[PDB]
């Protein structure tokens, strides 16, 4: 008796005192104090205020700077758009519901806000995967006579939308479901409930393997094989000081990317390990929602790492911000 079940929701609080209400109808202040809902709102405001300009400025400077519109950069524009789906489909909605203390848009808004928030983060995820595959193909040259062009870059972008739809869409048609999560102001995939009518179990396994394990293996193989290729080539040109400098910065950048991906990936595995073991107990409105809580920040630090630290974009954006000068 950990929570209160209802049609289209699961509140992580016991109704033995009769105070639980539908997360679609009334504030959930038994889950958390009003000021904690405010701090949830303040966190969404921070994400909006950092995440909109950075990701929008990424799209804007690409319009103003011809050098950025290369095919290898398409997937980074895709990342920028995905983060904007997170900012507007997710963070902005959640700022609004947060300040009511429940999901005021009803179950219909739940499927909508759950779709677009989930799609956004899933496109971002697979953009980091596709970018690693592309960099691996361009550097390690696994295919004999191959040249990466506009057509290949478009396939990569389309591929992320297919993978994101492969996660975000089934809950609208009967495999898993969208429900309010945590403090009941955002909607998402149901990992909290063994809903047999929508076969929640097999979807969690499908998510764990296809949308969690596979991304880690591809990112690690590709980038590891790339660092290996760059390090062997540098080893054969050791008197080229710039080749050595270029080798160090590629390695340093792969480490930053992979570490930043683990900062978002390991919390889910940490919580996962707390459900493989420690299966019996109940989970508060914060337990499985801690990884989701902190993964939202990827809408800010991913463009900082992949776009803002890109030597090209950085100078482009400085010129754009500075009305053309410097
Ligand atoms: C967590 O647990 C609580 C406690 O059980 C649930 O809240 C109760 O929900 C039931 C309905 O499911 C509520 O019952 C309905 O109350 C209506 C209003 O009652 C108030 O006003 C009357 C005077 O009209 C007072 O006497 C009473 O004390 C209340 O203050 C009634 O109009 C309803 O009557 C209709 O339905 C019943 C059958 O349930 C019939 O017998 C009647 O003839 C009539 O058709 C009904 O009684 C109850 O008031 C709620 N209690 C509280 C404390 O809120 C939550 O739903 C549950 N949470 C979740 C998420 O499930
Ligand atoms: O790679 C990633 N994939 C992500 C996709 C996603 O939203 N998640 C759904 C919940 C998920 C997988 C992760 O976490 C689980 C823990 C235990 C059992 C099943 C699980 O499914 C997010 C972030 C990264 Cl870094
Ligand atoms: C830098 C560390 C920040 C920690 C913030 C913890 C704030 C706790 O603050 C307390 O929380 C209670 C919760 O109901 C309130 O009722 C108390 O009035 C309040 O003082
Ligand atoms: C840009 C941010 C807009 C925030 C809009 C918050 C509106 C909150 O609305 C409030 O919700 C309460 C229920 O929790 C009602 O009881 C109040 O009457 C109502 O004013
Ligand atoms: C150190 C602070 C950790 C705070 C963890 C808070 C977990 C609350 O859960 C949160 O509820 C929100 C409302 O539905 C959701 O939109 C968020 O995705 C979810 O993480
Ligand atoms: C480094 C990887 C970048 C992308 C990380 C995506 C994390 C997505 O996080 C997911 O967001 C959904 C919608 O808010 C929630 O329903 C899920 O509970 C949550 O895990
Ligand atoms: C996804 C896999 C990421 C691969 C990161 C490789 C980091 C290797 O890092 C390198 O290791 C060398 C070991 O001799 C050290 O000598 C170098 O100083 C160091 O740059
Ligand atoms: C040229 O490259 C710079 C052009 C002039 C920009 C100077 C203004 C920058 C201010 C940005 C930070 C504002 C902080 C607001 C915080 C709420």
From Swiss-Prot:
Motif ('Ionic lock' involved in activated form stabilization): 134-136
Lipidation positions, renumbered (S-palmitoyl cysteine): 322-323
Sequence positions that bind Zn(2+): 201, 279
GO cellular component, one term: photoreceptor outer segment
Feature type site, description Plays an important role in the conformation switch to the active conformation: 113
GO biological process: absorption of visible light; cellular response to light stimulus; detection of temperature stimulus involved in thermoception; G protein-coupled opsin signaling pathway; G protein-coupled receptor signaling pathway; gene expression; microtubule cytoskeleton organization; photoreceptor cell maintenance
Tissues expressing the protein: Expressed in rod-shaped photoreceptor cells in the retina that mediate vision in dim light (at protein level).
Disulfide bridge partners, by residue number: 110-187
Residues modified to N-acetylmethionine: 1
The keyword NAD belongs to this UniProt entry's keyword annotation: no
Keywords attached to this entry: Acetylation, Cell projection, Chromophore, Disulfide bond, G-protein coupled receptor, Glycoprotein, Lipoprotein, Membrane, Metal-binding, Palmitate, Phosphoprotein, Photoreceptor protein, Receptor, Retinal protein, Sensory transduction, Transducer, Transmembrane, Transmembrane helix, Vision, Zinc
Cytoplasmic-facing ranges: 62-73, 134-152, 225-252
PANTHER family per the UniProt record, alphabetical: OPSIN
Function: Photoreceptor required for image-forming vision at low light intensity. Required for photoreceptor cell viability after birth. Light-induced isomerization of 11-cis to all-trans retinal triggers a conformational change that activates signaling via G-proteins. Subsequent receptor phosphorylation mediates displacement of the bound G-protein alpha subunit by the arrestin SAG and terminates signaling.
Name of the featured protein: Rhodopsin
């Amino acid at each position: 008796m950990c929570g209160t079940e209802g049609p289209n929701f699961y509140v992580p609080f016991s109704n033995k005192t009769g105070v639980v209400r539908s997360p679609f109808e009334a504030p959930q202040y038994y889950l958390a104090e009003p000021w904690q809902f405010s701090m949830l709102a303040a966190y969404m405001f921070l994400l909006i205020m950092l995440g909109f300009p950075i990701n929008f400025l990424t799209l804007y400077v690409t319009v103003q700077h011809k050098k950025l519109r290369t095919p290898l950069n398409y997937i980074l524009l895709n990342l920028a758009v995905a983060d904007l789906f997170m900012v507007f489909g997710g963070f902005t909605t959640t700022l609004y519901t947060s300040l009511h203390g429940y999901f005021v848009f009803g179950p219909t808004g739940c499927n909508l806000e759950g779709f677009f928030a989930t799609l956004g983060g899933e496109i971002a995820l697979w953009s980091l995967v596709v970018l690693a595959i592309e960099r691996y193909v361009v550097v390690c040259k696994p295919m004999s006579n191959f040249r990466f062009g506009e057509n290949h870059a478009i396939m990569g972008v389309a591929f992320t939308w297919v993978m994101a739809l492969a996660c975000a869409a089934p809950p609208l048609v009967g495999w898993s479901r969208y429900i309010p999560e945590g403090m009941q102001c955002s909607c998402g995939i149901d990992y909290y409930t063994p809903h047999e009518e929508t076969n929640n179990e097999s979807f969690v396994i499908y998510m764990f393997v296809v949308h969690f394990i596979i991304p880690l293996i591809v990112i690690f193989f590709c980038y590891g094989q790339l660092v290996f290729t760059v390090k062997e080539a540098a080893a054969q040109q050791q008197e080229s000081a710039t080749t050595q400098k270029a080798e160090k910065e590629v390695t340093r950048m792969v480490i930053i990317m992979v570490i930043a991906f683990l900062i978002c990936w390991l919390p889910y595995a940490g919580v996962a390990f707390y459900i493989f073991t420690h299966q019996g107990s109940c989970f508060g409105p914060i337990f499985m929602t801690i990884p989701a809580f902190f993964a939202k920040t990827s809408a800010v630090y991913n463009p900082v790492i992949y776009i803002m630290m890109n030597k090209q974009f950085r100078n482009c954006m400085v010129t754009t911000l500075c009305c053309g000068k410097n």
